[PDB]
Amino acid sequence: AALALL
Amino acid sequence: AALALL
Amino acid sequence: AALALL
Amino acid sequence: AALALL
Amino acid sequence: AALALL
Amino acid sequence: AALALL
Amino acid sequence: AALALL
Amino acid sequence: AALALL
Amino acid sequence: AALALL
Amino acid sequence: AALALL
Amino acid sequence: AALALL
Amino acid sequence: AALALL
Amino acid sequence: AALALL
Amino acid sequence: AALALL
Amino acid sequence: AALALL
Amino acid sequence: AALALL
Amino acid sequence: AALALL
Amino acid sequence: AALALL
């Protein structure tokens, strides 16, 4: 899994 | 922005 | 699965 | 924008 | 499935 | 706009 | 199926 | 506009 | 089936 | 079935 | 507007 | 099923 | 707007 | 299922 | 906005 | 499941 | 904003 | 699970 909050 | 690869 | 909120 | 690939 | 809200 | 491929 | 609201 | 292919 | 509201 | 109120 | 595909 | 209120 | 795919 | 309130 | 994928 | 309140 | 992946 | 309050 790969998660990003930008 | 919010991104997810699952 | 691939999710994006922009 | 909201995008989903499932 | 592929969903988009723009 | 709202698009769906199912 | 393919749906569009524009 | 509203389009459907079923 | 193919439906359109324009 | 397909229903529309416009 | 109100749309339904059933 | 697909429902929309716009 | 209110959208549902079921 | 996919639901949206916008 | 409120979005759900279930 | 994926939920968003924005 | 409130986001959940479950 | 992945949760965010922003």
How is the main sheet of chain A built? none
Strand content of chain A: over 45%
Radius of gyration of chain A: 6 Å
Proportion in helices of chain A: under 10%
- Distance N to C terminus of chain A: 17 Å
Oligomer: homo-oligomer of 18 chains
Shape of chain A: rod-shaped
The number of strands of chain A is 1
Count of alpha/pi helices of chain A: 0
Strand and helix order of chain A: E
Global structural class of chain A: mainly beta
Largest interface: A-B, 6 and 6 residues
Family (chains A, B, C, D, E, F, G, H, I, J, K, L, M, N, O, P, Q, R): Belongs to the betacoronavirus nucleocapsid protein family.
Protein name (chains A, B, C, D, E, F, G, H, I, J, K, L, M, N, O, P, Q, R): Nucleoprotein
Subcellular location (chains A, B, C, D, E, F, G, H, I, J, K, L, M, N, O, P, Q, R): Virion; Host cytoplasm; Secreted; Host extracellular space
PDB class: protein fibril
Q: Care to describe what's here?
A:
18 copies of one chain form a homo-oligomer. With 6 residues, chain A is mostly beta strands. Chain A is built from no helices and 1 strand. The N and C termini of chain A lie far apart (17 Å). The interface between J and K is small, with 6 and 6 residues. Chains A, B, C, D, E, F, G, H, I, J, K, L, M, N, O, P, Q, R: It is found in: Virion; Host cytoplasm; Secreted; Host extracellular space. Chains A, B, C, D, E, F, G, H, I, J, K, L, M, N, O, P, Q, R: It comes from Severe acute respiratory syndrome coronavirus 2. Chains A, B, C, D, E, F, G, H, I, J, K, L, M, N, O, P, Q, R: This is Nucleoprotein. Chains A, B, C, D, E, F, G, H, I, J, K, L, M, N, O, P, Q, R: Belongs to the betacoronavirus nucleocapsid protein family.
